[PDB]
Amino acid sequence: WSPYQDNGGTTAAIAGKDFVILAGDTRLNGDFCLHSRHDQSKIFQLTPYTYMASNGMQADRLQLQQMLKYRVKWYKYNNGGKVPSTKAIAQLMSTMLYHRRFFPYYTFNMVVGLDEEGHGVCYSYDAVGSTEPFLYGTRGSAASFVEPLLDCLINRQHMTSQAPPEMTKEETLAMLKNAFTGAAERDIYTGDSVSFFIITKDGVQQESFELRKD
Amino acid sequence: TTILAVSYNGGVVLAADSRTSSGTYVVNRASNKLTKLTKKIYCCRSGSAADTQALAERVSNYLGSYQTDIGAGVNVATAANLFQKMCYMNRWNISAGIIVAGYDPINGGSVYSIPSGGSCVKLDYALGGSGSIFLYSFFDANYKPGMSKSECVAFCQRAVAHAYSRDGSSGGLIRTITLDADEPEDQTIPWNRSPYCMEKDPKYVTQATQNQPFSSSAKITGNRMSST
Amino acid sequence: TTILAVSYNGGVVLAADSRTSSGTYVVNRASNKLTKLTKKIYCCRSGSAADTQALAERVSNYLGSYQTDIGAGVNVATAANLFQKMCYMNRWNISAGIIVAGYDPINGGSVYSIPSGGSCVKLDYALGGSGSIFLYSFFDANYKPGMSKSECVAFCQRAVAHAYSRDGSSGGLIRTITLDADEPEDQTIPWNRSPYCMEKDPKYVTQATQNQPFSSSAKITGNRMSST
Amino acid sequence: MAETAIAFRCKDYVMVAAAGLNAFYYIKITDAEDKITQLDTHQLVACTGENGPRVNFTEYIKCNLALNRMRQHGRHSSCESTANFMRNCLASAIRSREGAYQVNCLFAGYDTPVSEDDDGVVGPQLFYMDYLGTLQAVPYGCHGYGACFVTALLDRLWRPDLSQQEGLELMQKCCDEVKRRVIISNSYFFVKAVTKNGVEVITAVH
Amino acid sequence: MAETAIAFRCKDYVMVAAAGLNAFYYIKITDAEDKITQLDTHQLVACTGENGPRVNFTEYIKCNLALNRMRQHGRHSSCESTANFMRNCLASAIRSREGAYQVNCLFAGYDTPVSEDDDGVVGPQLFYMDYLGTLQAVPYGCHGYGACFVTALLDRLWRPDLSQQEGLELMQKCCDEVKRRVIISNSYFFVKAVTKNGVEVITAVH
Amino acid sequence: TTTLAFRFNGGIIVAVDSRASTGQYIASQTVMKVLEINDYLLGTLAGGAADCQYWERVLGMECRLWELRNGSRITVAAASKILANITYAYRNHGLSMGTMVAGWDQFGPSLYYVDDKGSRVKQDLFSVGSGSIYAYGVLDTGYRKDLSVEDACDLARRSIFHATYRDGASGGIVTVYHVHEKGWTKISRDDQTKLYHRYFPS
Amino acid sequence: SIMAYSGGSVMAMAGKECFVIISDNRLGEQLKTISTEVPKLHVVNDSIVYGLTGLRTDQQTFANKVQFRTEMYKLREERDITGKAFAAMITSMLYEARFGPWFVEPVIGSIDKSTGEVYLCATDLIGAPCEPEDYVCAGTAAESLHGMCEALWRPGMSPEELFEIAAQAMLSACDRDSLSGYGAVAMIVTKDKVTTRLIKGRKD
Amino acid sequence: TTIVGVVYRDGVVLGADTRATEGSIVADKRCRKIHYMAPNIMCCGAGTSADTEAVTNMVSSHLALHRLETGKQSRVLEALTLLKRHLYRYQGHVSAALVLGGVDVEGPFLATIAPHGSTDRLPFVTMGSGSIAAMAQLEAAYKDNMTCEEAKELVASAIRKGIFNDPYSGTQVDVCVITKDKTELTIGYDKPNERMYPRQEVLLPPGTTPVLKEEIRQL
Amino acid sequence: MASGGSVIAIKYKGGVLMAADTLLSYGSLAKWPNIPRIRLLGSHSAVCATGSYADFQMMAKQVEDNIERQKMYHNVDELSPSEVFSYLHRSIYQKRCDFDPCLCQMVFIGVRDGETFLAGVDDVGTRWEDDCIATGYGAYIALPLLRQALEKNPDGLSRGEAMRILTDCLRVLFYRECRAINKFQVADAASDGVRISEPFDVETHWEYEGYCFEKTAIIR
Ligand SMILES: O=C(NC1CC1)c1cccc(NC(=O)c2ccc(=O)n(Cc3ccccc3)n2)c1
């Protein structure tokens, strides 16, 4: 008997100049079996402008998510109503992961949102809180597939061809669909569907997107 | 160990063999595994003598306190419940199969099994001990419920005897107690009046033919009993 | 697995359940564990299907060669002896309880148990398998020797049914074969005409009273079956 | 074991030496960590083992000695006092939650009359301690991989009555033997002596 | 790892160095075991690891080369030949009853025209081998605890076209860095070079 | 990881790469591994990133409370000692930190290494991390006290570059900081692969 | 892990009457890099190329066993081995060693010289083939290479288009693998023409 | 991997999924797991691909040879005995797990061989990681004397249960029908997984990737 | 170590059904075949566990009590099913955090105001909600079948269709799960609250021609 279980799946985000897009696949896996093709537990709104995504053990992200949700309520009350910024929640999360150092949450988290200047950002974490800001991000079972592809299409460091324009939010979204789609094909623990959340100043669009069920 | 309990109309029988073994040696051949909790509520103990004696003494203590406090008889459910609590709180550190059985006037005779994990299950009869694995079929096949006290006593004695005739870890006497509206009747069948054993079953009198004499034929005769 | 064999006057019955389990899943629910060695000599296999099938095929082969060579029938002792040899030579690398039973005209019907260590013991009846632990008392209590063929078949079916009603690792059909002077009669009782199971024994129809409704009394009523 | 310390006491001094090496696995970081810590004007402790323990243990002693000298109007503790305090601190640690201080000491001192009334021992004192809190007065002692080479060399050459100069010569042979025979480069040794006149650093030997 | 060997090849020589240290656990037995073995007039192998393996492996190669040069009327094998023979011998051993020869080699040679007809490679050759029979031509390479210090130093300083003198200077910095930074005293290095004119011992560097 | 720092006459240089390995897969080519604690103190991160990030952040908080409590900046020796006392207190809790603490207090420039066991060493030159074994080779050979501040950054940058080039765990961007009397400056960031083409221009 | 000790990744992909096979260039002992000029490709003949990954000594040993086998084949049979035979052969060889395996993972590309049918095959270390139509790959960066090839690869690319996506894929993936890199070597193989190219990559 | 066989009135149907994983990555979306063994016998395998390929090839070859010796059609029970004897000898180390199905003179014959070399002749079977899921659809729907279509549908249905519930199984269903007369293998009898977003051609025009050197060679 | 085997559940239009064998095993031993493993919780919910019955019993008592007391002591509406399920899940999680895990997987059903609820929770505090749920071998054997029935009836199942498919699965579990018996109860949650059926059996088939002695014989 382990207190730890990997429930699999994959999150990815990409920041833009005035948006960030965040995605998680909805499969929740057990041992050698599949509990639900419709789990929305990976992505969790913290404030209107900040979300977290978590991979690993579904149980521990539920706990973590609630722990944060309450630190954020305390913060609101102790600061005359205002919500903590994405950067504050990002640092908060690092500190909470680390306070469990010893019996760690088995989550691989991302915090995403909008900075103060209104620019998208992503913080990715390891299990104890090492983070750093980045413009993109992917944790989970397909991470090691997706992450190099995003490297290639965003940064283009091995292309002579001059870098194309800044990616709009429609083009960014396509890019993550294409990369979730390829991952569902090849990582056996990712599939079913992807919930996308496009965070902007004007609110958060959701968008479901079917992946291949096998 | 073989312990069991059976309900009859208006009470219960508990029964047990008497052997306590340190593996393959018998340290006690006359243990009493039917342990009094209150006047009309008993447990049968299996597993670690130490553990089960400590719990029984603890539960019996609590239950006497409790009876003095509510000024009335104790229910078998209460005794089982306490036993279950303690068995479950200490499930990792003890080896302990219990049966709690007895008579209370509200519910008549009852039997509870509290096996190693600390489940508590209310049954018509219960078996416990290493020897119990031998009685499941015996009950399935030969136990009809609705027996009288006396029939039920004899049946439990038979059942224990069958078990301890095959379990190396059970043996000795068969102790029983009945528990109902009347006074408890304890009984102790000594081994040599056991209502069953293999050493006296006529179908185990003929020896297996293993030590055939050297012969000119394949026809099997018998064991070679003498040198000549 | 539950396998057994019993002697009657002039032959033997072999019986077995049909289940092969990879722990807790049933990979085969209609295995045949009564394996022909010669016309009138069979084994029942328990333990590793692989191991026991390999030995039975090997022994059956040797015995057919041997019968062709001596131009006469084979004795059950020969079959048991070979089985024992092979089981003992490979005792460390196989899991294998065998029973070898059959009919030969010199010795009538015979039964040999060859358990895991590779002992070979000639008996009146033999039990093997994980399920056998449940039948020892059943035989001790309910088996009288000197039964007719037909009585003996029915008794072995009952015995298997009792065993597989309690052993999680046995189940399914009950296959039997008789072996005597006449032609072998195989039989297969499907589970749904099993001569015993707990799911149809009337003494296991009443549910244990575990889920009592919330009440103002200690008087036990029944399980709470409905929300209202 | 990588860092060898050596000490011996003659009639009028106790001389202590210890290898500068500081390592990280095989990477040599410096050959110039002074691991001989002066605890008081006439007391020093050559201490070997990982920086963590060595520094925490020595700084604890040095403080507590200093504390006690305040709370005692400027009076120097005797060397035996100090050594027993160190021993008891080591010993206590092996049965603590935290665990043994993995360090080995040579504690050396020179006891002078603390007042007109002091009938006590005067002169050089040297103690061998090990991390478990063994504590033994010795005329010389060593720790580390060189410990045994040197110990046998001192058994051969040491006499109770060496001059301060014969002592420098003898300590040099000790350091040199440790360079000749230990695989681990103890290239530079710090050396100090304690005398009636306090701790002198000795640069003539290394 | 205790004994660091280093090599590098310029246009007209390949230069090889290796630490004299022979140890027994921590006891330094000598700083003067030459572990650079000449295999042929223009081939040498700096080999590191326990004496047992190192000597048995090198003596096997040296013999088999010699044998083959008999059974081939005095003709020198090419360096690539020899290196492949060594590789195959190492490799075969990791799957043998006896087990890997725990040794690491730098095989260096200088290939000269063996006859008028030889259209083959002429010049310095250097190979990195490891005990498992990895075999890689390299312009420089190292084994041992110093291996990495030196390798980064050579990546900084080595050029393909050093003079034989710039090479002695560069090898000296290599040896020196290994003395500065490895805890294990590699105090003396043997150094040899191979050139068109064969193996020269180099005493100017150590 | 490769980090190094050294004292010279002009101050302290500190240099680092930016790769964070999760064993064989590269999690980031962009970790910042110099933590700017105060504005007179830097620390490096090596080892467990969280451990270093967390306890260096704590150190920054202790440094700042010192300054509020006492009206004066904490000395480097104290700062390093604070961190060393933490890592010592937690020597049995498997922290992984190898840290440098560099700064310029009223006693001039000071450089400490503090590890996970509570070691605290004060040398003029250090390298730390998987790739240290490489960086010292390039560094030990070029280091002199009398380096200018270009020559010292060049040296520091090259040593990190050489570490990156050879060591699988080190990589990405070589960042160099200088620590001088008026604080610290971040001197430069360069991709280690641009640096390959600058140092070796065939 | 023994399969990761020496580092290195290889990948082959099919297009229309062509394939590309590509290796990275690194040779390590774990995190120590030993050389940056060790492409892992071997050319068997005009129409077959293979790469090995895994423990470098076994790459060397096995490649040499393959070259004995293939040269022997060509003498006995008086023709070039074809990629199907070639891969069957390999698989056979690896399976001989099933109970004490060669730590290699070959990746084979081939093109029937007539047809232009293209055959790729990668195998595990005991010689289980994987004969997909798209791309195969192996080594330390193999997860990421599947990432990239899935994304970038499409049916019926031409030598050039196919080279570009092979290179971007090898580099992007190698940039996420500590044990693979220093750019790559690639062979583009058509019916008519073999083209080798050394591709610039990161120096980390 | 999920393989399935059923016996029907005229023959045997086998089925398989087609995902070949490595680790937790789909190396091949469309591999053939239904091996030819004889003109009237097929095998599907699960377990360690290499072991399965070796073993079926070996036996296939032996039976080919045995057929020239004897002149007769291979019996499914010879196939099975050669397999079990082989697997038994390697004590499970050769981790092939086979469903073997053919039709001989004695009629349809379906069997499992487990890696340790046990067999179980049965009217429906499964092996593989998807085996339990698929077996459950067979227990739920199998009946005796199924028509060929009934049998194919059921085999597909069962394999779909693994495709959709076992991670190690997927892509599509292959089936093979074996009658007395002939053996009809049908790849993609069911394709229940297209791809749902059309691939996005990422444009990488020649010269896009920096090349250092180039060697061209004509043939 | 009394333990309970599979549980399976499915939503129909109108309610939820949950089914389980009435058996507790002890290892391989089928110990008690007449155990009412489904347990009602409050007025709208029921729960059943696979795994340690003792854990189950202690957990189910904790939850029953919490429900009853919250309601008796405050003039408040009984907890909804999601709320109870939430509580149970947090309870189970807290126990995994204390290294004192509740070693069961549980299925939970409930209905209130024609809103239905079906969820699963597992020893470590995994939880999930779906239109069908199973635990133990149910999850390997029956889910695929139940899932298949919900693909085919995407408008929801009727009670009869649902009960037809549940029953098909019980039969399959009976055949393929070793530690099982052919005695089941099914809880049905609907508007009205939850009823537990009387124990019932399913028809089994054992007389396929291929199961005959001659065919399954190892040696001819
Ligand atoms: O990077 C670390 N661990 C791996 C998991 C990432 C890691 C984790 C903890 C510490 C270290 N230290 C060093 O590497 C190192 C190497 C060489 C060197 O000179 N120093 C400075 C030093 C000075 C005096 C005494 C001892 C050390 N330090 C690394």
Residue numbers in the entry:
A (entry chain M): 126 to 339
B (entry chain H), C (entry chain V): 55 to 282
D (entry chain K), E (entry chain Y): 1 to 206
F (entry chain L): 100 to 301
G (entry chain X): 2 to 205
H (entry chain W): 30 to 248
I (entry chain N): 1 to 220
Paper lines:
The proteasome is a multi-subunit protease that is conserved between higher eukaryotes and protozoan parasites and is a key component of the ubiquitin-proteasome system which is essential for the maintenance of intracellular protein homeostasis. The core particle of the proteasome consists of 28 subunits organized into four rings of seven subunits and harbors the three proteolytic activities: caspase-like (β1 subunit, preferential cleavage after acidic amino acids), trypsin-like (β2 subunit, preferential cleavage C-terminal to positively charged amino acids), and chymotrypsin-like (β5 subunit, preferential cleavage after hydrophobic amino acids). Due to its essential role in protein homeostasis, the proteasome is expected to be a good drug target across protozoan infectious diseases. Specifically for T. cruzi, in vivo chemical validation of the proteasome as a suitable drug target was obtained with the Novartis compounds GNF6702 2(24) and LXE408 3,25 two compounds related to 1.
Due to challenges with obtaining the T. cruzi proteasome cryo-EM structure, we used the closely related Leishmania tarentolae proteasome as a surrogate (β5 subunit amino acids are 95% similar and 87% identical). Compound 5 is bound in a similar orientation to the previously reported 1(17) and 3(25) at the β4/β5 interface close to the catalytic β5Thr100. Hydrogen-bond interactions are formed between the central amide with the backbone NH of β5Gly228 and the side-chain phenolic hydroxyl of β5Tyr212. Similar to 1, conformational changes within the β4 subunit occur with respect to the apo L. tarentolae 20S proteasome to accommodate the pyridazinone moiety with a hydrogen bond formed between the pyridazinone carbonyl and the side chain of β5Tyr235. Additional conformational changes are observed in the β4 subunit as the chain of Ile29 rotates, allowing the benzyl moiety to occupy a hydrophobic pocket, forming π–π interactions with side chains of β5Tyr212 and β4Phe24. Comparing the binding poses of 5 and 1 shows the central amide of 5 overlapping with the urea of 1, the pyridazinone of 5 occupying the same space as the pyrrolidine group of 1 and the phenyl ring of 5 overlapping with the fluorophenyl moiety of 1. A cryo-EM structure of 5 bound to the L. tarentolae proteasome showed that, like the previous series, it bound at the β4/β5 interface close to the catalytic β5Thr100, although it also occupied an additional hydrophobic pocket.
